[PDB]
């Protein structure tokens, strides 16, 4: 019977299907099919409440591993029994480079939220910083920003000169600066950008939209996920990524309880093989997302140039390359799992105010 994996489409799903989905299906004799979504838990909640679950494995935001575990949607793993050791025998829990954020999480890749511009359209002045993203005088034009508050509030505060620490024990220091007053400042900063006649905002929802909007000249700068910009660059689109105040984030799979392949063990078998050392390394032959396992990272580095063409080195494009980390923010999934409802109410009220004050 087939196992249904849910992911984000475009270049990301392609990297997964080619890197580890199709190889897993061929090795196990369990078909592995892919469904596109745009994140969150609303679809799976609807399926679960209807008693009509068709999804088996979901590629999810870090915060949704926590929420989906707490809501009883996802299966709590027994990590070293369920996931494969590294080839040298290292247990999975010691090969994955840090701890899981929830008992329902297993890592796949690391990715960055950053921004890009179209070097052929932007003009002679070139954006170089997150402050430039917000600078409508030096860089007039529309911006594309993510539809949700998550990531936007962080970059807004850093653009306001509030300091992030990057990764360290306890998470990024930025989040202690995101209580009520900090959230209000961040909302005001986004509102300012989106209401400026020399700015304005398109809210993106799907990962392919930022590179497409830049390729077509619809915005001058767009936030997005670095792998989506990387894919467009490798297709010949003259985008340039800016890594100042990039947000380093961690992605996971979760196993859906009571999905079609749950009781018979088929979904778990697929998941264990997809998240193997070889599987996670294989995905990085296609997209600039870093494998979660130390063993997979070592394979990629030893195998450079690791890109599918046997020519392009992948390490300099990774979210975790030292050059790309110089001013990064580390995403905090507990913050968003805990606070997204309260914050989203204010965020959506801000967005509704943009329209009610907009004159055609
Ligand atoms: O779709 C993408 O490119 C990013 C990577 C993790 C999931 N979202």
Automatic annotation (TrEMBL):
Highest rank taxon of the organism: Bacteria
What residues bind glycine betaine, as annotated? 228, 289
* Cysteines engaged in disulfide bonds, as pairs: 69-104, 194-201
Q: What is this protein called?
A: Spermidine/putrescine-binding periplasmic protein
